[PDB]
Amino acid sequence: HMEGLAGYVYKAASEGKVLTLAALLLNRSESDIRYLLGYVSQQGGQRSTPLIIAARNGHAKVVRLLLEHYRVQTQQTGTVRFDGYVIDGATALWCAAGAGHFEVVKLLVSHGANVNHTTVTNSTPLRAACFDGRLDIVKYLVENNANISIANKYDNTCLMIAAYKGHTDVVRYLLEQRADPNAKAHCGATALHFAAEAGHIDIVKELIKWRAAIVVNGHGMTPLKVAAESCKADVVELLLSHADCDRRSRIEALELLGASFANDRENYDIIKTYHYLYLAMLERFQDGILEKEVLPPIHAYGNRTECRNPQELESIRQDRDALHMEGLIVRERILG
Amino acid sequence: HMEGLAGYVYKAASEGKVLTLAALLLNRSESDIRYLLGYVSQQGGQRSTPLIIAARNGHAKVVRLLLEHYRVQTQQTGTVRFDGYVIDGATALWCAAGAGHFEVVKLLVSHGANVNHTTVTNSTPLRAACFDGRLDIVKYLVENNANISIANKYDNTCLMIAAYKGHTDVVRYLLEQRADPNAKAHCGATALHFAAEAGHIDIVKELIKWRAAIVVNGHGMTPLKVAAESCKADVVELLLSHADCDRRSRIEALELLGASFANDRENYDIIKTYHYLYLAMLERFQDPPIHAYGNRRNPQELESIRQDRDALHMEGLIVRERIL
Numbered sequence: 261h262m263e264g265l266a267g268y269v270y271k272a273a274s275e276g277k278v279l280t281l282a283a284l285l286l287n288r289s290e291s292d293i294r295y296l297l298g299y300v301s302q303q304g305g306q307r308s309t310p311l312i313i314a315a316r317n318g319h320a321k322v323v324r325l326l327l328e329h330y331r332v333q334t335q336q337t338g339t340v341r342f343d344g345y346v347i348d349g350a351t352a353l354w355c356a357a358g359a360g361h362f363e364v365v366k367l368l369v370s371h372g373a374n375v376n377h378t379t380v381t382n383s384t385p386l387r388a389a390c391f392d393g394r395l396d397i398v399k400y401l402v403e404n405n406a407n408i409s410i411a412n413k414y415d416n417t418c419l420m421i422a423a424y425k426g427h428t429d430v431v432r433y434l435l436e437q438r439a440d441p442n443a444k445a446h447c448g449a450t451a452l453h454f455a456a457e458a459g460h461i462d463i464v465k466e467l468i469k470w471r472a473a474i475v476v477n478g479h480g481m482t483p484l485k486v487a488a489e490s491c492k493a494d495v496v497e498l499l500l501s502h503a504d505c506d507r508r509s510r511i512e513a514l515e516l517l518g519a520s521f522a523n524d525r526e527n528y529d530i531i532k533t534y535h536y537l538y539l540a541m542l543e544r545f546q547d548g549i550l551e552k553e554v555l556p557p558i559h560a561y562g563n564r565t566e567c568r569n570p571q572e573l574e575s576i577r578q579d580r581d582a583l584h585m586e587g588l589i590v591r592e593r594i595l596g
Numbered sequence: 597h598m599e600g601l602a603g604y605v606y607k608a609a610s611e612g613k614v615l616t617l618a619a620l621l622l623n624r625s626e627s628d629i630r631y632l633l634g635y636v637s638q639q640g641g642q643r644s645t646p647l648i649i650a651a652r653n654g655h656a657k658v659v660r661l662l663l664e665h666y667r668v669q670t671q672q673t674g675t676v677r678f679d680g681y682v683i684d685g686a687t688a689l690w691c692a693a694g695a696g697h698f699e700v701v702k703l704l705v706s707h708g709a710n711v712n713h714t715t716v717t718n719s720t721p722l723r724a725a726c727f728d729g730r731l732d733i734v735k736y737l738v739e740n741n742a743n744i745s746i747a748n749k750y751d752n753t754c755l756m757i758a759a760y761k762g763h764t765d766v767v768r769y770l771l772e773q774r775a776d777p778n779a780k781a782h783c784g785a786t787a788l789h790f791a792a793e794a795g796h797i798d799i800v801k802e803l804i805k806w807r808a809a810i811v812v813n814g815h816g817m818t819p820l821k822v823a824a825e826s827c828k829a830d831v832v833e834l835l836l837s838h839a840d841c842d843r844r845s846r847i848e849a850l851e852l853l854g855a856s857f858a859n860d861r862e863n864y865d866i867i868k869t870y871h872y873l874y875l876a877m878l879e880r881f882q883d884p885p886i887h888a889y890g891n892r893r894n895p896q897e898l899e900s901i902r903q904d905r906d907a908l909h910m911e912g913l914i915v916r917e918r919i920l
């Protein structure tokens with residue numbers, strides 16, 4: 261019969277009804293108080309504890325009570341639903357971090373919760389807050405000895421995800437806490453790779469100030485080819501305004517940028533196509549003698565052949581259709 | 597000294613102040629009037645003739661005088677700027693068509709303009725009106741013997757450009773002729789292919805019934821189900837209804853949109869990735885690649901997808917890599 265009361269207790273905890281929760285908990289034996297609070301409930305996909313669901317919903321009142329008066333264990337783990345995806349191996353500290361409930365986080369940390377508890381995929385509660393972007397929590401966790409080096413299943417640092425999610429504030433903070441910006445992932449990607457693809461120019465600048473290495477992913481893409489391919493012209497100029505395998509890599513990143521202005525249907529500007537593509541050809545002709553390794557015609561892309569001469573390119577500056585197909589040919593060479 | 601007056605005449609023509617032009621043009625000999633109206637002027641990038649510059653800016657008023665009073669030749673050619681690229685081989689008939697100046701269009705063709713005259717890229721005024729999408733002009737050109745079969749270089753028919761530019765209205769009307777057209781010849785694409793790429797579900801229905809023929813579903817380098825890559829689920833299901841080619845016998849019609857729903861960062865839904873991709877395992881089990889830098893996952897037999905993790909992202913990429 262006590263299986264039902266555990267649900268009533270869960271309800272009140274998930275609803276933040278501290279009086280409703282407190283009313284249920286008294287006039288119960290120590291044997292019972294443990295059971296009701298250690299019970300795991302299956303609300304759809306989510307499988308949680310009264311403590312966990314309260315910290316998930318930011319009900320600091322229920323959280324304070326469960327920790328102080330009824331000394332509930334912070335180590336309790338559950339499977340919580342964030343967005344549509346289900347995260348397993350989560351603790352009340354982790355949910356509170358992912359949902360941005362600063363006071364509940366402090367409550368859990370203050371009452372002795374493990375800041376470095378790892379989820380099933382080794383997502384630390386610090387990572388949840390870097391995904392979410394709450395600098396106050398991010399600061400508080402690291403100040404309470406949460407480890408920044410604890411990465412994903414796939415070695416996705418807290419720096420990486422924050423750079424991906426565009427949190428310039430936490431990214432800088434993580435970099436002012438000496439976070440290794442040259443750390444890479446299974447994908448082979450650095451935080452500069454994620455920022456360049458996502459075009460977060462402020463973070464790309466921040467990762468530069470902190471002397472990030474120009475490394476290559478598991479496709480042969482530097483952060484400049486990633487940003488050139490992602491049609492993020494802003495981050496292309498900045499990344500080019502420093503280091504690069506100059507000449508060869510620089511023309512290939514300008515040719516990729518120009519190609520993407522014809523492919524990517526969101527930012528499709530064929531005027532920006534000719535600008536970058538012609539700039540590339542001109543840089544190819546400094547000692548002229550820079551190799552145009554063109555490929556034979558295909559049945560797709562018409563039967564055209566990629567221009568090798570700056571006069572060939574000048575002759576399709578006023579052809580919208582030829583310039584489009586040329587951007588497809590360009591992409592084909594650099595990427596295949 | 598007479599080159600200077602040619603500029604004043606151009607100016608008044610370009611601004612459409614027809615009354616101002618007569619003051620310059622009157623009291624002049626045949627020798628001069630020929631030069632004054634045939635001068636080519638370089639106003640920025642565009643280098644054109646007064647008759648054209650009037651028709652480009654839609655000044656029907658100056659056009660009436662220049663075409664009616666002195667039957668000047670519509671064949672005069674120039675290079676006009678249409679907001680972006682500069683087009684060469686344009687005639688007043690073409691510019692007025694491209695600029696959507698219906699009044700100038702009617703006047704130009706009525707006075708004997710070459711209605712199927714092609715630009716440098718063999719763009720007919722009919723192409724211009726379907727590109728920009730003015731059905732009023734599109735129709736009017738067709739009754740006046742403009743040829744719908746003309747198309748440009750690379751064989752992009754007027755149907756194709758309208759099919760791409762989503763001008764459903766012109767498409768329905770335009771089916772007074774060819775459906776499944778020039779196969780883009782160069783691109784290898786049908787007018788319905790451009791429709792599927794752009795996901796204009798409205799015309800793709802037309803390409804089959806209510807005007808257009810059946811249109812060949814054949815292209816090779818991706819069937820007309822290009823929309824699976826273009827993340828156009830709307831037309832993807834639509835094409836799937838036509839069966840025995842894309843459904844009943846066609847077991848291979850595993851379009852697997854979900855791979856594209858993880859790649860395109862504009863329409864990226866990894867929930868939609870697993871949804872369509874799981875149909876593949878379910879359809880594959882009614883009755884494979886390599887691990888590049890630690891990959892597949894792609895198998896449908898393996899658990900029929902464990903789900904939940906972001907790993908599906910890289911898994912959606914493996915699918916795209918396999919299908920190419």
Ligand SMILES: CC(C)(C)n1ncc(Cl)c(Cl)c1=O
Nearest residue numbers: 447449453454457477479486
């Ligand atoms: C766009 C694409 C697929 C080239 N790409 N973008 C970003 C990153 Cl971080 C990597 Cl590793 C990558 O390969």
